Enzyme design. Structure first.
Site, PDB file in Angstrom:
ATOM      1  N   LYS A   1      33.543  53.012  46.332  1.00 48.11           N
ATOM      2  CA  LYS A   1      32.274  52.223  45.902  1.00 48.11           C
ATOM      3  C   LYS A   1      31.683  51.231  46.592  1.00 48.11           C
ATOM      4  CE  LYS A   1      34.353  51.417  41.663  1.00 48.11           C
ATOM      5  NZ  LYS A   1      35.601  52.258  42.254  1.00 48.11           N
TER       6      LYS A   1
ATOM      7  N   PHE B   1      43.277  49.434  55.031  1.00 53.78           N
ATOM      8  CA  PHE B   1      44.443  48.908  55.446  1.00 53.78           C
ATOM      9  C   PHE B   1      45.497  49.070  54.257  1.00 53.78           C
ATOM     10  CE2 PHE B   1      46.942  44.937  56.666  1.00 53.78           C
ATOM     11  CZ  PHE B   1      47.872  45.535  57.256  1.00 53.78           C
TER      12      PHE B   1
ATOM     13  N   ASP C   1      49.771  50.811  50.395  1.00 57.37           N
ATOM     14  CA  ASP C   1      49.902  50.951  49.301  1.00 57.37           C
ATOM     15  C   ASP C   1      50.554  52.229  48.355  1.00 57.37           C
ATOM     16  OD1 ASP C   1      48.784  51.161  46.113  1.00 57.37           O
ATOM     17  OD2 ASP C   1      49.920  49.180  46.557  1.00 57.37           O
TER      18      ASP C   1
ATOM     19  N   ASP D   1      53.813  53.101  46.640  1.00 54.12           N
ATOM     20  CA  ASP D   1      53.690  53.465  45.480  1.00 54.12           C
ATOM     21  C   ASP D   1      54.013  54.929  45.053  1.00 54.12           C
ATOM     22  OD1 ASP D   1      53.167  50.826  44.901  1.00 54.12           O
ATOM     23  OD2 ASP D   1      51.148  51.000  44.530  1.00 54.12           O
TER      24      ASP D   1
ATOM     25  N   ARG E   1      43.686  59.613  45.879  1.00 57.60           N
ATOM     26  CA  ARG E   1      42.836  58.245  46.195  1.00 57.60           C
ATOM     27  C   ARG E   1      41.386  58.549  46.416  1.00 57.60           C
ATOM     28  NH1 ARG E   1      43.293  53.094  45.414  1.00 57.60           N
ATOM     29  NH2 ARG E   1      45.310  53.212  46.314  1.00 57.60           N
TER      30      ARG E   1
ATOM     31  N   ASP F   1      54.972  42.175  43.736  1.00 55.45           N
ATOM     32  CA  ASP F   1      54.621  43.442  43.041  1.00 55.45           C
ATOM     33  C   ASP F   1      55.528  44.502  43.106  1.00 55.45           C
ATOM     34  OD1 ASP F   1      52.226  45.422  41.743  1.00 55.45           O
ATOM     35  OD2 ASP F   1      53.490  46.545  43.354  1.00 55.45           O
TER      36      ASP F   1
ATOM     37  N   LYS G   1      47.898  39.639  45.052  1.00 56.24           N
ATOM     38  CA  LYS G   1      47.579  41.183  45.380  1.00 56.24           C
ATOM     39  C   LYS G   1      46.405  41.687  45.340  1.00 56.24           C
ATOM     40  CE  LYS G   1      48.670  44.166  41.857  1.00 56.24           C
ATOM     41  NZ  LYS G   1      49.251  45.520  41.201  1.00 56.24           N
TER      42      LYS G   1
ATOM     43  N   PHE H   1      40.136  41.996  36.783  1.00 53.60           N
ATOM     44  CA  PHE H   1      39.707  43.089  37.487  1.00 53.60           C
ATOM     45  C   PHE H   1      41.173  43.911  37.759  1.00 53.60           C
ATOM     46  CE2 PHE H   1      37.332  46.148  40.034  1.00 53.60           C
ATOM     47  CZ  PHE H   1      38.094  46.523  41.158  1.00 53.60           C
TER      48      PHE H   1
ATOM     49  N   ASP I   1      42.518  47.476  36.229  1.00 54.94           N
ATOM     50  CA  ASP I   1      43.050  48.434  37.034  1.00 54.94           C
ATOM     51  C   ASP I   1      44.320  48.872  36.466  1.00 54.94           C
ATOM     52  OD1 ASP I   1      43.083  50.082  39.674  1.00 54.94           O
ATOM     53  OD2 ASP I   1      44.952  48.950  39.940  1.00 54.94           O
ATOM     54  N   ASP I   2      45.186  48.103  35.884  1.00 55.61           N
ATOM     55  CA  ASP I   2      46.251  48.633  34.935  1.00 55.61           C
ATOM     56  C   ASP I   2      45.685  49.428  33.736  1.00 55.61           C
ATOM     57  OD1 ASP I   2      47.367  46.954  37.001  1.00 55.61           O
ATOM     58  OD2 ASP I   2      48.104  45.380  35.408  1.00 55.61           O
TER      59      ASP I   2
HETATM   60 ZN   LIG Z   1      48.793  51.395  44.362  1.00 53.69          ZN
HETATM   61 ZN   LIG Z   2      46.721  50.289  40.049  1.00 51.96          ZN
HETATM   62 ZN   LIG Z   3      50.705  49.032  44.393  1.00 49.80          ZN
END
Ligand SMILES: [Zn+2]
Ligand SMILES: [Zn+2]
Ligand SMILES: [Zn+2]
Ligand SMILES: [Zn+2]
Ligand SMILES: [Zn+2]
Ligand SMILES: [Zn+2]
Lengths: 343, 343
Positions: free
Chosen positions: B50, B91, B96, B100, B105, B167, B193, B232, B236-237
């Site tokens: 976005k 980056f 990530d 993860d 994505r 994290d 993070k 925010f 996201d969670d």
């Molecule tokens: Zn992630």
């Molecule tokens: Zn997330």
């Molecule tokens: Zn992560």
């Protein structure tokens, strides 16, 4: 020698680096566990090597800066920047060992192969890079060369990353083509992936602290240093297969990883179609026997001998370059470096 | 709105970013294949989101800098720095998604999951970071704020990397302990993070270009922005489990990855010992059924409702912070940002 008698100071000074990178955040207790992990990452990854690159910044500093300017503080900045070069290296090795699927480094198992670490090692590598700039700011914020070092380190990283990109593109896994393993291609890879940050970067950092910021002086130093770097990576290629693991501290992966090594370029240049076909079908594969087959072909073509002859000629070639390009810099700056990597 | 009517300019300007990052090296033909790979990495990873973070630098620039100083060149620097923030993001996401073990994505398969890419993606991520500083130098070398931006971006990266370290440490794979999933711990993670680079960093960059370099002004902006950032990441969670994959553009992994998410912290706060035991035995595991078990427990505890109530209260809380801390800055700077992330 001029390194060896300055090494112990350098290695001991590491504790203050680790202390200062850890107490900077005492006023931030919430990140305590992260700061502990950074400690662990530093102690495991910035230690156990020869520290040649960092010692060079220091050694070159004493040779370039007038003695009546080498206060206890200028000295401290010198070996902080020296450790900064070692952190850059630590950053690149951690990531390189993952991408090369290596097993050991500096006599121990690779950070990322440690139980519990795994691919978290990626963020660990990035923290080591970050540490550089925390230190440049802590110690060199107010120096006239501050911004020059920042740009020097950033530029060196991009160059090394371009180098790694060539190194990986040229070695596609599961994709033999010996046809891309050429001499031009080889020289391009090692120039970017090794020569800039291993040889230009340390000396240039010393230069800038010594107030030598002239474009023409750096170009001259660069002519010598990138050629040293080319030989140094050829040496790294040779030792990857023929070096002694108790000495090199690590297991080689170039044949399994399908790498454009100096050895494979030399082999391609000397091989009969029968031999070429044997390389074609045994290279770039993980099977012990197929790797042994390649190694045997190298020895049959007497590449170890060829390498020993290139080390002599390279050394003469570098000495000439020093005669042409060293001034106004003390030739010892380059000679102590050459001495350290030749034989 | 003030974004939307400035978005299209921003997105189109990307071609010149990709052009200038590629022609810079035309006088170095030997790295052509690397520069091509960098192109591919940029087009695949800096696009399809976005662009909120980059647009913010730009939007905030028009609000902070006097119109009779917004020449065609100051404008160009503004959205280059805007794209620099997007590169930082690129980056961090690339890396990530590997750590993860994510699948998609921005509506496509993760860069590292593309056939042929794999863990080479690690060096790809580092090149994206390098690109930032190439652009800051190409466009802002001679500006008074040049060094301020360099340090701003570096500092933001270290903070985000500390954040990622928290994290990951808090979410050990194969290691359940719900006991470490606390509210304090949660707030620490997301502050570092997400909140620094997503909200402080863009606005601060705009500030520095506007000549606002005062420690006290940045602290004030920071008070508002890090609190926005906290919400925010809670959002996201929430969306990681309850969001719509056609909208979020990606598959959630927080339960499988054993993450200290806002959802798991809220669940821990409301659960009976029976429920707690059910979470204990189903969390942090890759089995569809065990993840569905956790999701069902969340819905039983009416967490989606709880979240909707926190979004209202958070929004009021952020508006108050804007009343207290916005001046001398135009409150619209923060209002256009708040408007973009709330509801
Ligand atoms: Zn992630
Ligand atoms: Zn997330
Ligand atoms: Zn992560
Ligand atoms: Zn390697
Ligand atoms: Zn490598
Ligand atoms: Zn090697």
């Amino acid at each position: 020698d001029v390194y060896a008698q300055e090494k112990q100071d350098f290695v001991q000074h590491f504790s203050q680096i680790v202390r200062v990178l850890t107490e900077d955040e005492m006023g931030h207790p919430e990140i305590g566990d992260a700061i502990a992990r950074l400690k662990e990452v530093l102690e495991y990854n910035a230690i156990g090597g020869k520290y040649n690159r960092g010692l060079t910044v220091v050694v070159a500093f004493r040779e370039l800066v007038e003695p009546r300017k080498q206060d206890a503080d200028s000295l401290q900045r010198a070996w902080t920047v020296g450790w900064c070069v070692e952190l850059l290296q630590a950053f690149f090795l951690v990531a390189d060992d993952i991408m090369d699927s290596s097993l050991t480094r500096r006599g121990q198992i690779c950070w990322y192969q440690k139980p519990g670490v795994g691919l978290d090692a990626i963020n660990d590598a990035n923290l080591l890079e970050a540490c550089i700039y925390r230190l440049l700011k802590l110690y060199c914020r107010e120096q006239p060369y501050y911004l020059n070092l920042i740009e020097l380190f950033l530029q060196s990283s991009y160059q090394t990353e371009i180098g790694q990109t060539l190194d990986l593109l040229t070695a596609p896994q599961g994709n033999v083509d010996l046809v891309r393993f050429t001499e031009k291609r080889y020289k391009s890879i090692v120039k970017y992936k090794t020569a800039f940050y291993s040889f230009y970067l340390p000396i240039a950092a010393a230069m800038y602290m010594a107030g030598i910021d002239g474009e023409k002086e750096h170009a001259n130093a660069k002519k010598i240093l990138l050629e040293m770097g080319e030989f140094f990576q050829i040496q790294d290629d040779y030792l990857d297969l023929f070096g002694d693991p108790s000495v090199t501290g690590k297991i080689g992966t170039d044949i399994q990883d399908n790498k454009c090594s100096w050895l494979v370029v030399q082999c391609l240049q000397r091989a009969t179609p029968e031999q070429y076909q044997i390389l074609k079908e045994n290279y770039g594969q993980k099977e012990a026997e197929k790797v042994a087959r390649v190694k045997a072909l190298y020895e049959e073509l007497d590449l170890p001998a060829v390498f020993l002859q290139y080390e002599e000629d390279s050394y003469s070639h570098i000495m000439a370059l020093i005669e042409q390009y060293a001034a106004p810099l003390p030739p010892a700056v380059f000679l102590g470096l050459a001495r350290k990597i030749y034989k």
